[PDB]
Amino acid sequence: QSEPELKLESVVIVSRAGVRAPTKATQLMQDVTPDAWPTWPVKLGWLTPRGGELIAYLGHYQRQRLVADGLLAKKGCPQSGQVAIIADVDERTRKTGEAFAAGLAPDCAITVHTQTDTSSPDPLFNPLKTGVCQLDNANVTDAILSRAGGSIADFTGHRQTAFRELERVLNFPQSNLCLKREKQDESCSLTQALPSELKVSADNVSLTGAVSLASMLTEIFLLQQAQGMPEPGWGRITDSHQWNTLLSLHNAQFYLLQRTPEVARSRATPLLDLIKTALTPHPPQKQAYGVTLPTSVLFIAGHDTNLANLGGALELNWTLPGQPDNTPPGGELVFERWRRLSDNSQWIQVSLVFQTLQQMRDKTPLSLNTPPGEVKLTLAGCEERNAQGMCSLAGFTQIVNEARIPACSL
Numbered sequence: 001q002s003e004p005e006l007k008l009e010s011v012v013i014v015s016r017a018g019v020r021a022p023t024k025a026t027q028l029m030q031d032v033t034p035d036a037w038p039t040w041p042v043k044l045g046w047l048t049p050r051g052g053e054l055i056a057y058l059g060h061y062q063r064q065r066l067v068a069d070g071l072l073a074k075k076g077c078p079q080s081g082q083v084a085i086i087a088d089v090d091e092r093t094r095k096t097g098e099a100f101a102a103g104l105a106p107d108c109a110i111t112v113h114t115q116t117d118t119s120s121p122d123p124l125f126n127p128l129k130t131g132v133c134q135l136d137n138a139n140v141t142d143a144i145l146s147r148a149g150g151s152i153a154d155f156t157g158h159r160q161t162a163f164r165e166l167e168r169v170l171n172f173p174q175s176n177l178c179l180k181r182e183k184q185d186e187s188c189s190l191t192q193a194l195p196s197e198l199k200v201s202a203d204n205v206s207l208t209g210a211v212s213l214a215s216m217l218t219e220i221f222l223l224q225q226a227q228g229m230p231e232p233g234w235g236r237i238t239d240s241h242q243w244n245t246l247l248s249l250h251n252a253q254f255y256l257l258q259r260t261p262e263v264a265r266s267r268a269t270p271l272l273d274l275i276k277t278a279l280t281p282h283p284p285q286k287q288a289y290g291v292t293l294p295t296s297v298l299f300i301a302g303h304d305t306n307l308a309n310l311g312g313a314l315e316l317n318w319t320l321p322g323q324p325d326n327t328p329p330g331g332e333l334v335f336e337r338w339r340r341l342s343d344n345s346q347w348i349q350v351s352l353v354f355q356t357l358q359q360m361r362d363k364t365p366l367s368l369n370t371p372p373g374e375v376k377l378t379l380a381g382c383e384e385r386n387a388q389g390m391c392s393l394a395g396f397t398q399i400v401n402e403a404r405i406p407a408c409s410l
């Protein structure tokens with residue numbers, strides 16, 4: 001029987017945290033809808049038990065997958081250090097790492113390593129926020145406006161259909177923001193009522209107004225749906241086209257602020273360094289987070305901006321059939337090193353593993369038989385590929401080295 005010509009030797013997963021309750025409950029969020037936002041079972045920004053179950057399913061799926069590729073043994077707990085887990089200091093990322101280990105190796109006790117100071121942000125997940133490095137204000141401003149077509153107005157203008165869909169779901173017309181508006185000479189509009197301005201500083205970039213509000217609100221509706229709440233969007237979201245139209249507002253903001261290279265490259269540099277060393281064969285040694293690398297599997301519990309920053313820095317673009325959110329909760333950017341048996345050459349494969357919005361909704365258990373969705377990625381900048389379309393280690397290493405910003409390494 002035909003034999004595999006490539007042997008899996010290393011896997012690095014960068015996962016976004018799973019389903020959580022919204023991070024905030026502002027007055028603005030209430031003013032754009034006359035209806036009352038549904039309450040969540042956990043504190044704001046915390047992982048919901050259902051969210052952990054969905055992550056555990058992915059962990060259960062990955063265990064079957066890696067076993068099939070012979071990287072992990074089908075029985076028992078993995079050898080010490082065989083599986084390493086690192087998470088951002090947040091409650092939701094720590095819990096995502098735990099839910100993943102739980103699903104991957106039940107009752108096996110796999111440490112979830114984090115930065116030691118938990119009351120402080122971890123620069124691995126954003127070197128801009130902690131001041132490791134700074135953004136070039138003028139250059140970032142030009143790059144974002146450039147990707148916006150010259151102006152934020154023209155940008156939102158091309159997405160009015162999506163903004164009106166959101167208004168419809170909110171019953172924006174009967175919101176206090178609308179009824180208490182002084183220029184009632186014109187129809188009430190989110191984009192009109194909340195002008196979006198681009199804010200850029202050394203440590204951050206943002207969009208004020210309807211752009212950021214809509215990105216947050218549409219993500220909240222996806223969260224309600226994934227959380228299994230009765231009627232997400234107060235029952236006003238009734239079909240797939242609406243889900244896509246709504247979430248496009250979310251993907252639109254990430255395209256501008258997280259994928260733009262002038263931002264992404266600096267923001268994803270620490271992760272690029274970690275991913276590269278973890279995938280590069282070399283003498284194992286205890287290091288960051290007390291983790292020993294290289295090893296067989298490395299699971300990194302991060303955030304959606306991390307996935308988007310990595311996509312922009314590596315020029316990895318994707319769309320996920322069945323999942324309106326390009327960087328969905330639990331979504332995994334999977335990096336794998338395969339060794340070609342023929343000449344023992346090294347190769348890197350990249351894919352985006354995710355659960356469809358329905359798989360989240362029905363909380364469906366995953367397995368090789370009922371697997372999550374997966375999109376194989378192509379490194380836009382790679383030249384040397386193998387028969388399977390993977391990039392050589394050398395090629396991959398070159399792309400990472402050209403994409404990272406030295407000033408932003410840890």
Ligand SMILES: O=P(O)(O)O[C@H]1[C@H](OP(=O)(O)O)[C@@H](OP(=O)(O)O)[C@H](OP(=O)(O)O)[C@@H](OP(=O)(O)O)[C@H]1OP(=O)(O)O
Nearest residue numbers: 016017022023024045090215216217219302303304305306
């Ligand atoms: O870590 P935080 O300080 O709590 O910031 C969070 C986090 O963003 P980051 O990727 O930069 O960490 C969320 O991403 P996830 O952890 O859920 O993957 C994001 O959620 P969404 O962009 O998907 O909505 C949310 O944004 P939001 O304000 O809309 O809740 C945002 O909050 P901040 O805007 O306050 O930073």
Ligand SMILES: [Hg+2]
Nearest residue numbers: 113114289290
């Ligand atoms: Hg540790």
Ligand SMILES: [Hg+2]
Nearest residue numbers: 277285293294
């Ligand atoms: Hg190392």
Ligand SMILES: [Hg+2]
Nearest residue numbers: 304325327328
């Ligand atoms: Hg996202």
Ligand SMILES: [Hg+2]
Nearest residue numbers: 219304325327
């Ligand atoms: Hg998201």
